[PDB]
Design a protein around this ligand. Structure first.
Ligand SMILES: Nc1ncnc2c1ncn2[C@@H]1O[C@H](COP(=O)(O)OP(=O)(O)NP(=O)(O)O)[C@@H](O)[C@H]1O
Ligand SMILES: [Mg+2]
Ligand SMILES: [Mg+2]
Ligand SMILES: [Mg+2]
Ligand SMILES: [Mg+2]
Lengths: 927, 157, 158
């Protein structure tokens, strides 16, 4: 920045700048700097391929660039790129070492080659290619290299371990520990764990060699292998350490030629194979599974089916998996799960292959149910089958029947009793199926009497499930159960009240907030059902307090603290209560894994805060405080506005972040969105949670402009803008941006002076802003003035707080908001050097791809807006524009654009200066 | 190739006096074809085969029979017809203007379009090329279907 | 047909029947006979991949089946499958020839290997890998193979 980067110092600046990203862990700025202002040579465009899923297209380019023999470093580029992509057998067979058989003398840069050579010779266990490598290492005179001697000592540990010599291999592994503990190791509490991990994998592979060598017979050898399989559970799930540790157990088990070591070795190759096909690297899963065929395991016929499936050939995988399924018409071949899972796999990707009709798949779904019925993964699969086939029929001219929703509810509700680990992403599908055809049986019921019988007995299905499924799983559709109460069916209204009775008896303390906000409205029908739902609750036997009445005493007090507009210190002893605080660290469900309790330990309200706050926003909005069971301040914002919009936005967010926390394209980059529990109390009022440690970027920019004495106004700032014509907007914007230099990049320098925390915080900023940058635009967020873009001092996340207006409402008002989202020149150099062409764009495309892949789920979550407000054509059109933005349609000349096209469109119209001049100075753009 | 070009066009009337084979090279031509657009189902003792696949023909296809060059070139023909849906439908749009009627000829074009895109004719949703091929073959050689049709289309040959 | 094919003569009938398709030019019956009544061994299902656009998925399976050193013919299966897919540089860098630098003596089935080796060494133009291959050919005594001597003469022409 301080160097004039318009000049040509960016050649000597960048030959080490890309080195500072290619072992920092970050790729999405490395890929962003390699394609921005560095596009002279074509080899630089080739080096983009080795990080973007076509790495083998760059490998064989490097294999012939690296066979020019003109540079010493274009060879080690090829060797490091082989090592980073685990091509160990291809390293040890390279002609850069084997001139004929041996290697050259003492090492100027060949030490960087010999390190990779020894390490790859260790990771492929062959005593001959490892035993003559140390013939060449030991011909040297004075090995200075810190890095060669580690893999040398591991090599001679392996060579002694093939000579059945335990104390000698313990000696060389202790040499390896000495060298790591003195030379390789560095300081903790400064570095990450991401850079220690390359050393921890070598240490974890040094321990298991000592732990497998320390054995005299197979009785403790089997116990050592089970302890190592226990050590393969703390390991995580990333591919590089797993492949390294399994490669070292592999290299142990084929240098020690026990028959029990060979039986271990087949297990290691099978775990390498199914490791590598789950990590999109079936290049080596195949050539590892072929080692399980000389042993002829009875399970590789199934594993080659998944390798064929991930490669891309569906029909040969289907042929081999039915070839082993009609092999399972013979004897024992355990009947419980080794037969039902194979048939379930045959059905699950006879579905995906689209090679069969519906009845052929269902006719063997029921055969899965015959062969094993105590297992809900087939019920999961058949429920997803019907709740996919419903869309794949409704995509054509298909209208409302009942049976494909009947059977969907019928099999999901029998799935939900067994292992309950997928309730979040399947039960909203359930109850929207439960209350689509129920209202369709009221709309024009007199044949379409078939759907009336269909709702007539899936009401029975819902009752059977509620009498023998767990209770907490209904909380996931709680607000979707808080709407649709006024349903006008009268056989589901009793069930939608019983579904709140059941959720109130067990675990009252969380949902009593919602059940007391229920008995409050302006339309006097919710209140009747609220009294009716509290009647049988206080009629139940366990009445631990009179806390329904004190709950109403909290509720009417907290809805009276939004009417008294002053432009008072009321009741205080309502706290403490067994009622629990409305903060999102009360009101979540801990994500159900397979005796767990659904909640955190209860942090109940203790002392109601006395010192309130109220500030000079639009109407006169105010903030309370709560002291909880740990004695912490929990912040409460009490708005006089309909926060049903806020609650459904936040349920879109809490169905979006759980998809972000499962996609491997988004868990690799750690995408998330901020979150706060927001509750209604009555129409045009509500409560919402305060995230701590946050500050607006208006408050950042004010105190960073005053630190440089840039004089400006706030009311004289926009009367001139009122005085500007249609031509003066552009020059007015281009002058007001020359007044203020962009300064948010050094605000990150003044929160995280530790540069590692700075780098992680700026990545966290760019990524967390990039996700909501189009989650808001797809939801049509608007009103994004810099008093509502909150940033936290702790880690650098981004949250968006106002959001009263949604569904492109910012365009409806004069001097309209014609930006997609606030991308605005303080933010762009805060994103980095390359700015928007980096982690921002990449995580943008990943978020848009995840929203396109999950169109039905996201739209199903957001379907409840038209039932919270029950209007027409001011709210249907909003959902249609929402659906077209989710599918990826450009808003003019409507036809579907790509994710890298929709991203480019939204970015180059958000940062477009002709757009940024037009909007109102409340959304002040020049900042 | 014509085994499903005819079925997609709804060929029918495929009795063995209309399956012509040339002595020179062994090609297959289909000559009668008066009836088209699934008209063979409209008449009693109806034609419920997709195309005449009939046990003299199958061992003439080879040892493996229908699971061979027949199935492979079948899938290649269906894939080419799916890739060129707009051109083939545009060529065949002129039927509704040679005959200028309604709903005896619009429905024929809609069933034609659904067969070109690859929709199974019952429980309508798009099936794959190796699925549409398997469906048409295992319902053409299915002996329960082959018993039903009229002896003019004599099936046991 | 005349043999009762319900009985189990289809093992000795098919180990040469697939040879009669894999150089007749036709693949779509070879692929049809390899997946019909011949589905015992998994290696036969692997040999379907080398004609159906995922041939490199079968290549690296053959590279580790062919590095078991138990059969002489599972090596030449790998070599012919490399040659049919033009992997000439990968043939001349194979460890089936380079024990350390040179090759074994007079040829029972290695003539089928040496033919592929000379031909791939011709098709990649490198005087060093071609000039020491004929150092190994010319150390032999009485080369009978009709197929080796062609690519040898092309090699010494080069
Ligand atoms: N969950 C939250 N965490 C932190 N601060 C919050 C939160 N919710 C609201 N705020 C604060 O609320 C302020 C403005 O409140 P807001 O929800 O925008 O109501 P408002 O009256 O509509 N303000 P505005 O529309 O911008 O004039 C912001 O500047 C934030 O500091
Ligand atoms: Mg606001
Ligand atoms: Mg507001
Ligand atoms: Mg005729
Ligand atoms: Mg006729």
């Amino acid at each position: 920045r301080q160097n004039p980067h318009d000049k040509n110092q960016n050649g000597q600046l960048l030959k080490n700048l890309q080195i500072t990203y290619e072992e920092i862990g970050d790729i999405d700025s490395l890929d962003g700097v390699l394609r921005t202002f560095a596009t002279g040579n074509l080899v630089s465009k080739i080096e983009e391929l080795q990080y973007s899923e076509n790495w083998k297209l760059a490998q064989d380019c490097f294999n012939v660039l690296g066979k020019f023999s003109d540079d010493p470093k274009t060879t080690t580029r090829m060797l490091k790129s082989m090592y980073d992509h685990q091509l160990y057998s291809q390293i040890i067979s390279n002609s850069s070492f084997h001139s004929s058989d041996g290697k050259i003398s003492l090492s100027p840069d060949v030490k960087e080659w010999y390190s990779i050579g020894l390490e790859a010779a260790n990771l492929e266990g062959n005593v001959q290619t490892l035993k003559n490598w140390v013939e060449q290492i030991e011909s040297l005179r004075n090995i200075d290299d810190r890095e060669v001697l580690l893999q040398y000592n591991i090599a001679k540990a392996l060579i002694a371990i093939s000579n059945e010599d335990p104390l000698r291999t313990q000696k060389y592994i202790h040499n390896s520990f000495r060298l790591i503990g003195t030379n390789f190791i560095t300081s903790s509490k400064e570095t990450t764990l991401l850079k220690k991990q390359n050393l921890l994998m070598k240490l974890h592979s040094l321990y298991d060699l000592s732990f497998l060598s320390s054995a005299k017979d197979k009785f403790e050898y089997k116990s050592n292998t089970t302890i190592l399989d226990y050590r393969m559970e703390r390991i995580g799930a990333d591919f590089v350490p797993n492949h390294y540790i399994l490669s070292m157990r592999k290299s142990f088990d084929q240098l020690k030629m026990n028959e029990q070591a060979d039986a271990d070795l087949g297990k290691t190759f099978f775990t390498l194979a199914q490791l590598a096909r789950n990590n999109a690297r079936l290049d080596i899963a195949s050539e590892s599974l072929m080692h399980c065929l000389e042993r002829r395991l009875p399970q590789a016929e199934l594993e080659f089916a998944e390798i064929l499936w991930k490669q891309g050939e569906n029909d040969r995988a289907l042929k081999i998996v039915q070839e082993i399924h009609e092999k399972y018409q013979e004897n024992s071949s355990v009947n419980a799960r080794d037969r039902a899972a194979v048939l379930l796999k045959f059905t699950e990707w006879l579905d995906l292959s689209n090679n069969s009709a519906s009845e052929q798949i269902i006719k063997q779904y029921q055969d899965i149910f015959q062969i094993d019925s105590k297992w809900d993964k087939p019920y999961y699969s058949i429920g997803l089958y019907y709740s996919r086939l419903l869309e794949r029929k409704k995509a054509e001219g298909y209208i409302t029947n009942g049976r494909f929703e009947y059977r969907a509810i019928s099999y999901f509700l029998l799935a939900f009793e067994k292992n309950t680990a997928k309730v979040r992403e399947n039960l909203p599908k359930v109850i929207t199926f439960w209350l689509d055809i129920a209202a369709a049986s009221i709309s024009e019921a007199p044949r379409k009497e078939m759907l009336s019988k269909a709702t007539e007995d899936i009401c029975s299905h819902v009752e059977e499930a509620l009498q023998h499924c767990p209770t907490y799983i209904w909380y996931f559709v709680l607000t979707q159960l808080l709407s649709r109460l006024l349903h006008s069916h009268q056989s589901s209204a009793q069930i939608i009240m019983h579904i709140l009775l059941s959720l109130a008896v067990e675990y009252p303390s969380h949902i009593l907030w919602y059940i007391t906000a229920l008995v409050n409205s302006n339309s006097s029908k919710r209140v009747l059902r609220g009294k009716h739902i509290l009647e049988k609750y206080r009629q139940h036997s366990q009445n631990p307090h009179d806390l329904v009445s004190s709950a109403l005493d909290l509720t009417k007090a907290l809805t009276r603290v939004c009417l008294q507009d002053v432009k008072f210190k009321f009741d205080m002893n309502v706290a403490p209560s067994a009622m629990v605080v409305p903060v999102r660290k009360n009101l979540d469900i801990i994500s159900p894994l397979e005796g767990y309790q659904p909640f955190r330990p209860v942090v109940s309200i203790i002392r109601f805060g006395s010192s309130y706050k109220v500030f000079s926003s639009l109407k006169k909005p105010k903030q309370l405080n709560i002291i909880g069971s740990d004695g912490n301040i929990y912040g409460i914002m009490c708005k006089k506005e309909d926060v049903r919009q806020d609650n459904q936005y936040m349920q879109f967010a809490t169905t979006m972040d759980f998809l972000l926390s499962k996609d491997i394209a988004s868990r690799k980059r750690s995408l998330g969105i901020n979150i706060y529990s927001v509750l209604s109390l009555r129409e045009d009022c509500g409560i919402l949670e305060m995230v701590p440690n946050v500050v607006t970027l208006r408050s950042i920019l004010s105190t960073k402009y005053e630190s440089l004495k840039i004089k400006y106004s706030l009311k004289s700032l926009h009367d001139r803008w009122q005085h500007t014509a249609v031509d003066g907007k552009l020059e007015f914007y281009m002058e007001q941006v020359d007044k203020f230099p962009p300064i948010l990049y050094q605000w990150f320098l003044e929160n995280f002076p530790d540069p590692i925390n700075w780098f992680n915080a700026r990545n966290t900023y760019a990524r967390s802003y990039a996700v909501m940058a189009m989650v808001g635009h797809i939801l049509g967020l608007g009103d994004r003035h810099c008093e509502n873009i909150l940033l936290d001092i702790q880690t650098g996340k981004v949250l968006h707080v106002d959001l009263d207006c949604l569904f492109e409402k910012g365009k409806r008002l004069p001097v309209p908001e014609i930006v997609p989202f606030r991308l605005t020149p303080n933010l762009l150099d805060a994103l980095g050097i390359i700015g928007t062409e980096g982690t921002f764009k990449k995580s943008s495309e990943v978020t848009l791809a995840l929203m396109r892949k999950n169109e039905v789920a996201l739209m199903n979550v957001i379907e409840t807006i038209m039932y919270d407000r029950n209007m027409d054509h001011s709210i249907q059109k909003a959902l249609k524009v929402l659906r077209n933005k989710i599918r990826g349609i450009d808003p003019q000349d409507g036809l579907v654009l790509s994710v890298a096209g929709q991203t480019e469109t939204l970015i180059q119209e958000a940062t477009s200066e002709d757009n940024l001049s037009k909007m109102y100075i409340g959304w002040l753009p020049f900042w």
